[PDB]
Amino acid sequence: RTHSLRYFRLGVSDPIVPEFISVGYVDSHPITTYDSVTRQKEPRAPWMAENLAPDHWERYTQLLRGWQQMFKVELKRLQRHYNHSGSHTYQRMIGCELLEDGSTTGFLQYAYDGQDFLIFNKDTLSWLAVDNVAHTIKQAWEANQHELLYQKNWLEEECIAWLKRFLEYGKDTLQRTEPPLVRVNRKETFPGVTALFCKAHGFYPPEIYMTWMKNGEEIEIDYGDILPSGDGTYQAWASIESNLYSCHVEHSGVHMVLQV
């Protein structure tokens, strides 16, 4: 199945709320956490703590302590180069994508005030700046060719290495399949008019696909977002207002038809 590993970094110029936070995710699951008020890398999922040695946490904590410091300095410089008044935020994101077909994807990005700032191209070994301020950072990061090379390999090989490892450490949670409970109920969305809701719940992974059909043709369709139920399973829905309709549904390989 198609999986991902991505770590996020967050820096805030005027904290209350920690100045720096970093959290890792295997798919939609938080697996690691670090903040400026604990100054210690801790696990989020129990299977992480069980499988990773005490030395792992010790070593990445010193790494993260140093990364926090670099984020402080970068955010101060960005703030001053903009002569930006008030509170501002710096964000980093790095990840993996081990696709079902064996292919991979790697990405590395930065964002100042929640808007794309520097995007890394691992094939060209370049940085994509959004403006004249981002550009002077690009000029400096593109100078150190060794770091660019180091990054490409981290994303292309090392990141996938780690992802595959974690998938084995938590195969009972990440590699599980909990099929949806699909139900169709008719409920008048306004006076006179009548709609059909295709409510689906208790499914995992959260990736699902709902849709309506008119004797076979795809219908005009109102939707409900995929939402966490709180039990580790997700929920979703879709709806439409003389013709015979059916709710065609696809989740984690199996595809369902619910003719009404």
């Epitope: 070593r59 790494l63 302590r65 140093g66 410091q69 670099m70 090379l149 390999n153 981290w154 290495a161």
Partner: antibody, heavy 108, light 116 residues
């Protein structure tokens, strides 16, 4: 998890010399070649992280991540090259794992 | 980048305490290293200096004999408390780059010889 390179190497002045370095590790984030003359601190020579041979003058540094193997190639060898050549790689948790270093003896 | 470490050579009696300072003359170093090279042996790492954190020691190193502290972001200082002729060695300082790939920059020297 360990790294290996020859203890000592002797070669005639003017010929190509290949210092092989072979590792094995769970994780890898690049390989360094350092040069260190007797009673002095080491000085950077190279950083290979992607597969292939990379030239940098008289010296060359090759890497095969797949074969867990690297080599420093000193060609058109000189008397000044009698030094010690340290090999080290960055493992999974960004720790530098040093080799014992090859002592290169240039016979004229 | 350049790292400088003073003194270059030092002679001290058995029982005294010698302090080797180490400064990165350009950039600020979040982490600095302490290496040692007994004649004749490989370059062995003995400690890791970290800003806003404690000092990490290795297999042989005894936290009671050496006193490393991250003074500034430019300065790290190793202090040999109660020196003995067995402690006499070549002490190299190192500073890691800001970037993650981990290139180190070494200080030249120091040659410490303890004499009773």
């Amino acid at each position: 998890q360990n790294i290996d390179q020859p203890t000592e190497m002797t070669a005639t002045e003017g010929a190509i010399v290949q210092i092989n370095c072979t590792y094995q590790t769970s994780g890898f984030n690049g390989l360094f070649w350092y040069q260190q003359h007797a009673g002095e601190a080491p000085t950077f020579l190279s950083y290979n992280v992607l597969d292939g041979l990379e030239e940098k003058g008289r010296f060359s540094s090759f890497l095969s991540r797949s074969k867990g193997y690297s080599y420093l190639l000193l060609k058109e060898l000189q008397m000044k090259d009698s030094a010690s050549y340290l090999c080290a790689f960055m493992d999974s948790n960004y720790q530098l794992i040093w080799g014992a270093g090859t002592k290169l003896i240039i016979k004229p | 980048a350049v790292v400088s470490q003073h003194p270059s050579w030092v002679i001290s009696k058995s029982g005294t305490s010698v302090k080797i300072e180490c400064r990165s003359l350009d950039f600020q170093a979040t982490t600095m290293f302490w290496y040692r090279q007994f004649p004749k042996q490989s370059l062995m790492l003995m400690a890791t200096s970290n800003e806003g954190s404690k000092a990490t020691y290795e297999q042989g190193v005894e936290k009671d004999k050496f006193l490393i502290n991250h003074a500034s972001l430019t300065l790290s200082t190793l202090t040999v408390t109660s020196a003995h002729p067995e402690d006499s060695s070549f002490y190299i300082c190192s500073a890691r780059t800001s970037g993650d790939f981990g290139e180190q920059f070494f200080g030249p020297g120091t040659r410490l010889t303890v004499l009773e």
